[PDB]
Design a protein around this ligand. Sequence first.
Ligand SMILES: Cc1cc2c(cc1C)N(C[C@H](O)[C@H](O)[C@H](O)COP(=O)(O)OP(=O)(O)OC[C@H]1O[C@@H](n3cnc4c(N)ncnc43)[C@H](O)[C@@H]1O)c1[nH]c(=O)[nH]c(=O)c1N2
Ligand SMILES: Cc1cc2c(cc1C)N(C[C@H](O)[C@H](O)[C@H](O)COP(=O)(O)OP(=O)(O)OC[C@H]1O[C@@H](n3cnc4c(N)ncnc43)[C@H](O)[C@@H]1O)c1[nH]c(=O)[nH]c(=O)c1N2
Ligand SMILES: C=C(Cc1c[nH]c2ccccc12)C(=O)O
Ligand SMILES: C=C(Cc1c[nH]c2ccccc12)C(=O)O
Lengths: 412, 412
Amino acid sequence: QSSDICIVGAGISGLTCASHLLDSPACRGLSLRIFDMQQEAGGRIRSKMLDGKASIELGAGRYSPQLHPHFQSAMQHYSQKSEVYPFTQLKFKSHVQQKLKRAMNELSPRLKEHGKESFLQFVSRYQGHDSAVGMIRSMGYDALFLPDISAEMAYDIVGKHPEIQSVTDNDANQWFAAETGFAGLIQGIKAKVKAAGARFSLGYRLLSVRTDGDGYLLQLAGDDGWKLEHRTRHLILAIPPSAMAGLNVDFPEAWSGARYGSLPLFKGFLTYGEPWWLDYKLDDQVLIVDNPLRKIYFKGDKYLFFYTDSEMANYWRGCVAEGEDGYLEQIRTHLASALGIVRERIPQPLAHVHKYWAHGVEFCRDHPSALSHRDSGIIACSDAYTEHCGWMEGGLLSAREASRLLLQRIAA
Amino acid sequence: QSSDICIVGAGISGLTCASHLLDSPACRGLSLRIFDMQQEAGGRIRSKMLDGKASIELGAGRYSPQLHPHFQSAMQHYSQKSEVYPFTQLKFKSHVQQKLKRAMNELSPRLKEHGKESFLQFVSRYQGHDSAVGMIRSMGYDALFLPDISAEMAYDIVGKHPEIQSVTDNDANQWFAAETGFAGLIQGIKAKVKAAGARFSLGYRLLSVRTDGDGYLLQLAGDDGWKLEHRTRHLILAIPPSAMAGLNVDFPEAWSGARYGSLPLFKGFLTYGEPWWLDYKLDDQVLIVDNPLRKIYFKGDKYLFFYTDSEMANYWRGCVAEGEDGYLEQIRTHLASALGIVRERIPQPLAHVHKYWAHGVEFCRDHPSALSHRDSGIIACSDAYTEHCGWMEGGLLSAREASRLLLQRIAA
Ligand SMILES: Cc1cc2c(cc1C)N(C[C@H](O)[C@H](O)[C@H](O)COP(=O)(O)OP(=O)(O)OC[C@H]1O[C@@H](n3cnc4c(N)ncnc43)[C@H](O)[C@@H]1O)c1[nH]c(=O)[nH]c(=O)c1N2
Ligand SMILES: Cc1cc2c(cc1C)N(C[C@H](O)[C@H](O)[C@H](O)COP(=O)(O)OP(=O)(O)OC[C@H]1O[C@@H](n3cnc4c(N)ncnc43)[C@H](O)[C@@H]1O)c1[nH]c(=O)[nH]c(=O)c1N2
Ligand SMILES: C=C(Cc1c[nH]c2ccccc12)C(=O)O
Ligand SMILES: C=C(Cc1c[nH]c2ccccc12)C(=O)O
């Protein structure tokens, strides 16, 4: 139970690490072991079949070739078919939405000086606090209110999310989703590294790690309690900052000078006996509302879903904890108040699924695509270390840098 | 986020507790909350569908109406069909098996003065250590060799297990299994307590508990990380001693004067394209072998499985951790040597499932059917607190007493 190279984390970053490493002739003859505390690879990529009828994305769901060329290239590399992602339009702009577009354009020259303060305080410079609250609310992302989200970061959030990208004049970017779910890409990469000799040990959580001569000694625990020790010569931790902080490896202090934050996310998918929303011409439309649903998506004639973050992600999760009955009834109420129709005219769902991610988004509050432990030479890999914080593209960028660093260590 | 009565643990014990409590008129109008860290109820009762062709028992799998009258009463009370459990035959005892039968009989009077020493040392009085090892090994239960397992406990283990009960002249006891799996009983009890107003919160693990005036404050965590606080006036911890030690309740010192132990268990089921074992007339037979499989069961022409405990349970779990391929080739190697045939005359399995229980059996090292905390009044319910420690009957006995103690607290 040992290896030459070990990767902890079978998300898109770790699987892509193993892919680069196994493509290099420098790794010929070296064993490679991949761990993940979950029984299936993918991480924050989780595709599911809603009532066995349609494919849905409980995790990452959309991408843009203009923003994410490495992801586009990976979809092609593994012959994954893409489809148009329709939730990019915002023609029915409200007064507050048009006001924010104008305010952000008018305030942009002030980013050099005040770009580091919270987005809320930055927008408050336009017409006051109250006006800023109403403007920011109309974007549907509650993270924009948080004091740890600076003005610069918020311009990045607005300009990069398909529903609100027109607010910073990024209409040109196209958006696509996986025809069969991004899980097909995960499996394509897993099958690729497995065929190249990589061995997978799924269902094992890394608890601690120590230096052991020229290598490392890992302590893992299976999901059923089975304790396990693994010795390796090279170690990549393809896990996000929230997980790094639990391994007692002095993260982030001994890995970088930046600080890192995270945000919870919540998605709920509902399907019905009939596409009742067609009576309102809402198919392929997204509604942003000052309502706990926040963002409401109607996928053609198949289903609907909502997507929330920060305070509202916790709202729906706490609501879920009180029981599924009250949860579905709350959705019914908020759908009526959001669409302006009598609650009794909103039918009950035929089937539904929801997912809560305590750390759905992890972001840097300020450089290298991958990190090196000051004290041991372990490598850290995550989208949080790149210019694409919170996106799969960032995971691909980090994996490339992490594998380059390791091959450098190998040739040392 | 509160209740009058809270039960942690949705095994047969906790569910039975709720049934008794809800049958009492003193609980009319009181709210009942049931937590469990698993997403499904049942605990160590886990039924599954092997290749979608036959129901198997990854946990508890059989019972005897002579040893377990309360469990048969529950099966009947919930209209659960039973079927004959065939693995009771020991008609052609081997020399060392016959010798252990005679030894345990002759040494029986020595139990009063020496019954508390280890079974191995106790049996060594007959013909020495080597002869004792040969005899004990032929029972198929590695627990019989443990120093913590006294002679009194061993006599109970041999006389209460179907495969070897005839070694202590308990051949009269009948054995039965569930026609659809014991999960049908769990579902029956769950549906009943649910209809009576009990509300379930599955997927939540209790982390700590502290007194709060006349009630208690429970800190729980969902399987997705969601932190939850719950307040109750009356609490039952229907969890085993191993799970009690992980809490902040001063277990066991503040609950009883006895200590507790546990043993790991492992089951593995395999299905094939053909019932190849019929060529050897092994259907409905069980083989006990000086071989890592230990106990090999052939269920008619449907499937086969093996059952191990103690070091052999850990042997198979470590073997599983090294890879599925190595795990299945090891079974094939051991089946060949156990039947006296060549490895290549044993086909590869068509499908298989296994389960490792880190604490499959939990027992007392030496009285009340349920325990109570000295100060807080929290009640503890588990089979390990009864004369049937390690059996579902013990859970029913503990539940009855635990419900009794809680009702005494309600009416105080
Ligand atoms: C709801 C929602 C919605 C979106 C997104 C996320 C979420 C939650 N994302 C972001 C995207 O999911 C994310 O950027 C990448 O999946 C990150 O992949 P990584 O492999 O870097 O981490 P990721 O978190 O995916 O994987 C880390 C892996 O490490 C494992 N692990 C962690 N700690 C461990 C330990 N101690 N021991 C063993 N294993 C451990 C985990 O089990 C996990 O599988 C996204 N991106 C995008 O491009 N477009 C989009 O539309 C979205 N939308
Ligand atoms: C392989 C194998 C084979 C057998 C058996 C066990 C095993 C593992 N048994 C024994 C039988 O399974 C056992 O005696 C009872 O099912 C135990 O029921 P309890 O509800 O008391 O505990 P059990 O362990 O079943 O339930 C406890 C529950 O509490 C939950 N829990 C624990 N800690 C928690 C926390 N901190 N927060 C939230 N939830 C928590 C657990 O998830 C679990 O669901 C058996 N018996 C028999 O009569 N005949 C047989 O043939 C067998 N064979
Ligand atoms: C890719 C994401 C995730 C995400 C990145 N930055 C955020 C800021 C706030 C809320 C979600 C995100 C998305 O499609 O929302
Ligand atoms: C009911 C059980 C569980 C059990 C009780 N005591 C034991 C000692 C050794 C191995 C298993 C058990 C069984 O069917 O083996």
